[PDB]
Amino acid sequence: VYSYTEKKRIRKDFGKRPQVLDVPYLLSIQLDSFQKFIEQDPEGQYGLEAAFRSVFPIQSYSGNSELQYVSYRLGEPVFDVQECQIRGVTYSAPLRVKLRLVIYEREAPEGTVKDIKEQEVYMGEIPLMTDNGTFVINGTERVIVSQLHRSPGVFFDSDKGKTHSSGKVLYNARIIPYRGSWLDFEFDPKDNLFVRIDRRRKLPATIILRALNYTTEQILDLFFEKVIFEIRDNKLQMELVPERLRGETASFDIEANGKVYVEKGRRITARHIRQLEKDDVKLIEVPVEYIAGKVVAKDYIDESTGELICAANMELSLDLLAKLSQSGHKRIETLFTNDLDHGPYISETLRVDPTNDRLSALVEIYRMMRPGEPPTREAAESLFENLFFSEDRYDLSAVGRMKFNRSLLREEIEGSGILSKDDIIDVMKKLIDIRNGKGEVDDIDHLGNRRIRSVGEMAENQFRVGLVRVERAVKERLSLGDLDTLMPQDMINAKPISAAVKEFFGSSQLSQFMDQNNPLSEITHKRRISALGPGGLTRERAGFEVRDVHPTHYGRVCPIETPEGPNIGLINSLSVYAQTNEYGFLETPYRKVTDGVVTDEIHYLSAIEEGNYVIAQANSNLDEEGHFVEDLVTCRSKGESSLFSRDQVDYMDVSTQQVVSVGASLIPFLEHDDANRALMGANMQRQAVPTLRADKPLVGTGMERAVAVDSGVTAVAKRGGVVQYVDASRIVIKVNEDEMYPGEAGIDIYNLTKYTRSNQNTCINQMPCVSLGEPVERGDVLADGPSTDLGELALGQNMRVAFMPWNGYNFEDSILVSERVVQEDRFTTIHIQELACVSRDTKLGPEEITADIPNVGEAALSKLDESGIVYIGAEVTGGDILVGKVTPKVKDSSLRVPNGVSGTVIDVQVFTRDGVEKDKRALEIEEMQLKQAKKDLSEELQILEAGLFSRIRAVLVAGGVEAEKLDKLPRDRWLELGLTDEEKQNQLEQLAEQYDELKHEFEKKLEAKRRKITQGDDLAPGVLKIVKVYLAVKRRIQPGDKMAGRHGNKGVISKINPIEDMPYDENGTPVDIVLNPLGVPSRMNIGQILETHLGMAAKGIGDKINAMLKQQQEVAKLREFIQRAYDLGADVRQKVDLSTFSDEEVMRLAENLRKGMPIATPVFDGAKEAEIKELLKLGDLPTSGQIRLYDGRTGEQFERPVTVGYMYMLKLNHLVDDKMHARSTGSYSLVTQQPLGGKAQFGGQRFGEMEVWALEAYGAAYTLQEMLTVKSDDVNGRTKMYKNIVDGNHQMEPGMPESFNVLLKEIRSLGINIELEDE
Amino acid sequence: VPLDGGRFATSDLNDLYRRVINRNNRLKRLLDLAAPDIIVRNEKRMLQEAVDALLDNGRRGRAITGSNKRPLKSLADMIKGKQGRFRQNLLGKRVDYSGRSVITVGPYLRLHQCGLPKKMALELFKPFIYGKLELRGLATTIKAAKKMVEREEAVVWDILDEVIREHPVLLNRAPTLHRLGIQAFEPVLIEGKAIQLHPLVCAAYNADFDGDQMAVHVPLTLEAQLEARALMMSTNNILSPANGEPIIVPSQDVVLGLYYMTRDCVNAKGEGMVLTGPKEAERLYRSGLASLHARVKVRITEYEKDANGELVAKTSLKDTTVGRAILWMIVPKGLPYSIVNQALGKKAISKMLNTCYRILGLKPTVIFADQIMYTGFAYAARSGASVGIDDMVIPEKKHEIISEAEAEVAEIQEQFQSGLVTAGERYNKVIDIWAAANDRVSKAMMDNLQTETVINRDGQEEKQVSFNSIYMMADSGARGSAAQIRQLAGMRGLMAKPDGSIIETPITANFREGLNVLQYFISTHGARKGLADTALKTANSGYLTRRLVDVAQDLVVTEDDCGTHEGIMMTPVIEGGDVKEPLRDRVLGRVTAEDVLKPGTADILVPRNTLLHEQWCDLLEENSVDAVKVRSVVSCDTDFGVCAHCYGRDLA
DNA sequence: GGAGGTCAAAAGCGCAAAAAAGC
RNA sequence: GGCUUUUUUG
DNA sequence: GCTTTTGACCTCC
Ligand SMILES: [Mg+2]
Ligand SMILES: [Zn+2]
């Protein structure tokens, strides 16, 4: 079964893998993000509500007054999208917020309210997203790309010893908050722990430890293990367990209860550990020499003397042992300090602590944060507190806290936005464990540590910054308390927030100018992920690791589609099925596998979870019951790819297409292409130019329909029905009975854009693709946009190509193209240019626009009206005049055609400031626009009044008035008629008054439209009025253009060749492109040969259908053929039966297939060569796909048969007339007197420094001396050069470059004296 | 400078000067009333800050920023750096009489000329046209001449053609890596809007026809014109300065044409007959009466310069093919016939061309190169060599071989299950097994592809070198190598992780057939690395060149002889295996520091202060001298220069 | 007492193009 | 005509 | 951020 739109031309496709999940809405990453930013969230966790709850309520310093938030809404936009685009105003919505002002008595208990005041407050204009996920700022369309940055949390990284000579590995731990100051813990080559904040001077770590009110004893308790000693008779015995014997050497014979357990002198052994644990002995004596290396854990003082016998973190000797024995200190606490297991890391840092009382510690912190300042204790305490524990100045966000807890093996994932002592302690402990071999470092490039930030988050961040500024302002204002004099609106000033949001949307790193010259470009532009921008890497700062592709990129970002050159691997594009998680992590679909059966259940898996399961392959051969046909299948588990049994699998890929982006997925036969050539093929396919008339690609992928429909370039039926009136500019759709609303059903109208400039000077055009009086359903395609054909993406044309060297005209990469291509206008494009003339008010008289021009012949005024603006349709050329603007001196400042560009004027737009008289030309355009708008509105009026009067006649027939008498009477007389039945009379007068209601609201919308059109346009200050002119040019292909295929075989047209010279086969049909075979093997993009072969069969089926149509053979035998073509193939998923099709549908489909049957091919489930041969056999074509050809010039048969087929060719956006220019003598720069640069400025080229070296390498000195002095800047001498040339004498004058004198003065502008010398 | 509207454009210099002068005025006014010292200290200090910012912004600390929030330019900022005065407006500066365009191949041009669009030529030579119009009297005032130029009158094109007969122009392509990046040409007027270029020199520019753009400059004076003609003309640049190797080597399409010309078939139409000469042989091929390549006997005549610079004729019969006889016409007199009797791949043909330059000077060798290019293009076009899907012959054994390899690993993994092998042992074992399987498959594929059977004259199968299109385009060296042919038919081979580890499971599929999803994925690890390295190597490498130029830009040869005996000994470099560089090339083209002494004691093989060349080097080879001490530039004694003999022989 | 070790600051990091905006 | 920001090609 | 280099302060012998 099919809807009626695709029944017009069913595109046959190969492919053996059934679809489980169809392609989602391609734009869901963008649009669904912004919906989180303006919808009302009762929970207060998303967008504006969450932003408001984080600043409000605000209380005065005295606390007698506060301001509270109530609710908000977004007002209706003043204009729609089209009016904003034409007028150059930002499509935006006003912001309404209900604020509450509460006053407290200072003489009453707290909470006693003096008065309350409720009032909505204007807060500014918020830009609003259009229907296609774009933004409109100043008549243009800008789209916000999605950033990709380091996930807030904590990471452990190792530098691999590169920075040190010995290569010893150093470990560091970093905590990256969502907003606030960082924190770094590092190990030095001396193996001591240090802490630093915000990349400042490195500081000993223990400084922070005591800053949290920790004594030395507490630190040693937290970071080490205790060893206890008891004073027995002349002995210091200790309790020993086997577990604490790892990696130790028995200095003496380990024995207890009089039995020797361990040998003496050598290292410990596991067998001795086993026998000791079997004995289960705890206490053991130790000699004195073994205690010579241990460190006391705690402090010891004498009760009698009261003096410190020995403090903690201090080595002990036999004399200290004597004091502790004579003082009664029986129990001695020491540190375990096993270097191979528990290194003395913290103790050594303790040994280098400058102070211990935490006062000088806070002083040191405060000095380090800001050098050269008085160290006030309270100031230092406040600095530390608001540095790492203030709720406003530091915030870790929900996702950061979740990552922090997950990394530290905690369980609860909900917490505060500020840190805690325990969290820092835990991070330190895990860093020590990492140093001890336990655990493993994290990976930066892993997609589990990087998140996707959309437009919503960025808008929220800008809004919060603005809100902080305005709340500081209102707090300052409220500090000067007043006895309820003000209303809760004066203190709130919307200018800061409005300016902040506007500047972020307008001028920023990521707000980019959308390049919409074909639907694929703008789709793949909306779906871009960038690692640049605020809070990310720069173009140079990135190393060789971020650029490279990581094994967790499977299914989430396209590995083969990315810009090439200065930033590669930083602008990777999102995949097809991938969608962002709730936290902001990329995740992909998968199918659950239970008991070797693959169900249709779909689970979305993020990066981290992908590391725990076993994932099968997309094209894993499968039975009819979900059982894997082998017991051995290919799978991937953790970045590896290995065989597995049928029972260890858990998930399988949804479809074979889920690895590449859209741009790569549009490339047929991708599975036979090198990665480099596929990359360049996609990147060039993104840059096609719309053709004058579009043609379907014969060999596509099959998702062109999805790409075209998803992008907003083709009008789509909102409600199904039957088409009523069709026009080259408007379409009228009457809705069906079921789909109409209960009231005011009416009809639906679509207005089509015709020849409006794009953002790269190409033409946006729409042509209806439906006829009069045929049904349409919901979601069909009614009007094809640019480069679209029946709702199918169509970038370029399809040309009859042959691979053979031809007298060198296609020597290296060039293409030789026959004249029959340019005769049929298959590549001539339309380019539209824009010119603007401004009228300001300067001195010496303002800028006036009129037809009065001095010192000009009547030729320059023939193409001008009496109002001073060119007529619509004049064939203007270079150097002519468009808008006559003069300034009294009269100064001829009128706008002129830029040199070298011709065209035909198609539209003129005039903008006038409010309160300014409009000239007659603006009056004409205004009245014409009003007339067209009233024509439209009166058309809807006629339809609606006809409907309501049909209702009225239905009422009146039942009322008693005869139908014939009704019909004879005039239209408006039906209301005044009398009806005997009261309710029928009541219904008649009621309809006459909703007649009145309808006409009156039509009248008020009339007056509103008339006022808006007459309403003065908002302009820049100091500007009176501006005028704009549009120019239309048709470009044809000429030697030097850039044409390219889809697989990366670009090139340049060499020579347009007369048709009689091209090679031709036995049938006499020439080939109109002659490519070059030598570029296939080395480039190794063998996909193009297979595509050529497949296309050659596509026209083979097309020609036969053409033969039957010419002979007008019966539908029965025709219907027989078409069905046989579709059934061809092995286990093809698509099955089409033409029995259900009626004869008319079959005939229309056949005549629509006349130019060749489209053949589709999924990206990685392509058609093999066997069915290609089979399809070729269906026609009368040779199976090998190599026919003979005859030379056009000689008529001699080519010795070896060559390849002929149909290849899809795009014309790139690189035209010669946009790049070829030359200069003899033009303008000159004002400062250095060197000629200008750039084609638009008519300047010469740059004799580069490398060119100077190369010209120095020759003996050529005179030419270099020319380049330096005469042709560049010797203003005194270069004039003499011109005069000499005209006289015939070829000689120069050296002179001295003027640019050197400037520098002289400039050096003299400092205190340096530099001067020349004598001759 | 004023823009549209009442606003004015102001530079950073004006703002800083205004600030400093205003502060000076304020302090000088405040000092007159003798304010308390606390006031004057701050004013003087912050005036110091203002002057500091004036002379150099951002050196001391926080920099002065404007409305753009970015630091303002200062005097020190306007001298240093790429945007400063020196590197942007003194060492390189924009010029007049220049233009830009897109490159396009032209086969019909000769070696010493290039195309030019009409509009570019007219715009460039407009100053020259004005003078010539005055001389012929077509217009008297310069205004009149300018008027008739823009109308494109019929006389304008005639006078332009007359004035551009021998006016050389310069062609360069940024970046100009080596000195061959700028070459002179003699323009010829063509239609269209693209610049036409000769194919042979495209290798020197490293320029391909995929949208690369050229710039043209025009010399003015007689000194400049003669300088260009005698130094930078194309015909004077055939040996690269880096090394003696030629720079006009034919490539790609021409090579395939020559290869297809000279290759016999075991049987063909018109095989086994006798032909009078090459002139007659061309008559047979065009008439279709004999195949382009079939072994015959032809009378040929070759000349030798073996006498005292004189050519002597000789005549006999040689057993060759029709195509070789056709090719023999364009070879000049001196060369022997054996040089044009082999398969004539890429490596051979250049060699042959080089021999001409060794014997026939310059004019014959350039004419011969041009004739080679013409004939190659013509007979490659008439050949019709095309690539199809069936040309990729997939070896039959390949499939089963993979099975065997599988069985091998099926055992090795078991050894890990039993614990008898470690991770490293298994890894190395599977790596070796897969590498051996790859080598076997590649060898089998090449052996199957490179030969084919065709019936001879007596009706028996005979093996000849195959005429498959891919093999022809690979063996001739026209384009590609055995690695790519491996990539098409046999397995792709082992692929690497980003860090450097080798994946244990190789890609068993080839490009002719399909690649399942994960194989294509793991194949992109290497390609992204290659693209990233290629993109980021051009930034580092080019910069390095700069540092080399500024160090060595003071070196010019100034004196003939320095008169020192000091030098460095030269020996063939050896690591213990084969010689990496023999003694021949290292010492070639230098001067002997001391006389070369024979292994026989007290015999003078080579006199002191004698340049070495082919006539002296072969003498060393026959005599088998071990090592020689040669004079070198590092030891020359002349100050502020380099001895002429010390530098040795100019390689150009 | 000083010669050695270790930490802190400045300077650089292709070239051509084009296209736009904005200041 | 200077600077800033991107995008793209080589 | 890379990397180098150079200067300046600490300090171990
Ligand atoms: Mg190129
Ligand atoms: Zn010398």
Side-chain angles (χ1 to χ4, degrees), chain B residues 562 636 643 646:
Chain B
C562 72
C636 178
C643 182
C646 282

Side-chain angles (χ1 to χ4, degrees), chain B residues 173 206-212:
Chain B
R173 161 165 175 267
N206 198 17
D208 55 332
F209 298 89
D210 64 354
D212 289 4

Side-chain angles (χ1 to χ4, degrees), chain B residues 559-564 631-633 635-638 642-647:
Chain B
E559 201 173 2
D560 289 331
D561 202 315
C562 72
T564 188
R631 195 141 60 151
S632 179
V633 55
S635 60
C636 178
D637 62 49
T638 300
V642 161
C643 182
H645 289 80
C646 282
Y647 185 80

Side-chain angles (χ1 to χ4, degrees), chain A residues 473-628:
Chain A
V474 66
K475 198 78 85 192
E476 202 270 356
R477 177 54 199 60
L478 193 53
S479 181
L480 324 172
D482 47 356
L483 71 164
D484 207 27
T485 71
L486 296 178
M487 294 299 291
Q489 184 214 59
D490 312 336
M491 57 295 299
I492 283 300
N493 195 358
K495 290 172 72 175
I497 48 178
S498 179
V501 175
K502 196 44 180 273
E503 64 86 19
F504 153 71
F505 264 83
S507 296
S508 173
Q509 185 35 248
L510 294 197
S511 177
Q512 291 180 319
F513 214 80
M514 182 169 73
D515 52 353
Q516 45 96 32
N517 63 7
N518 44 2
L520 177 63
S521 175
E522 66 183 2
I523 291 296
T524 195
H525 189 25
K526 293 166 183 177
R527 301 170 55 99
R528 277 173 63 186
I529 295 171
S530 177
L532 306 191
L537 319 178
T538 75
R539 189 179 316 299
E540 190 277 331
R541 205 180 221 170
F544 273 10
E545 275 56 35
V546 191
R547 291 200 157 78
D548 178 335
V549 54
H550 196 278
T552 61
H553 279 163
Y554 189 102
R556 314 194 170 78
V557 295
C558 182
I560 71 174
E561 197 270 10
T562 177
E564 184 204 340
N567 46 358
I568 181 169
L570 302 187
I571 314 297
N572 51 292
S573 170
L574 194 72
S575 179
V576 168
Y577 290 73
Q579 65 186 28
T580 183
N581 209 0
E582 54 159 10
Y583 290 104
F585 290 153
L586 291 190
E587 65 183 1
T588 66
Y590 284 118
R591 310 167 59 180
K592 185 145 197 175
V593 176
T594 79
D595 298 332
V597 186
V598 184
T599 66
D600 43 358
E601 182 65 26
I602 304 301
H603 286 90
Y604 284 103
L605 292 199
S606 75
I608 302 173
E609 288 78 0
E610 191 159 350
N612 307 352
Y613 296 99
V614 189
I615 309 299
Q617 274 302 272
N619 58 4
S620 314
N621 59 5
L622 191 65
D623 74 330
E624 304 295 325
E625 322 302 322
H627 298 65
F628 289 63

Side-chain angles (χ1 to χ4, degrees), chain A residues 1291-1311:
Chain A
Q1291 194 162 21
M1292 65 179 288
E1293 196 278 329
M1296 192 265 257
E1298 176 72 22
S1299 174
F1300 170 68
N1301 278 322
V1302 162
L1303 186 140
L1304 264 190
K1305 298 306 165 46
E1306 196 165 342
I1307 287 184
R1308 292 180 183 175
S1309 179
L1310 300 103

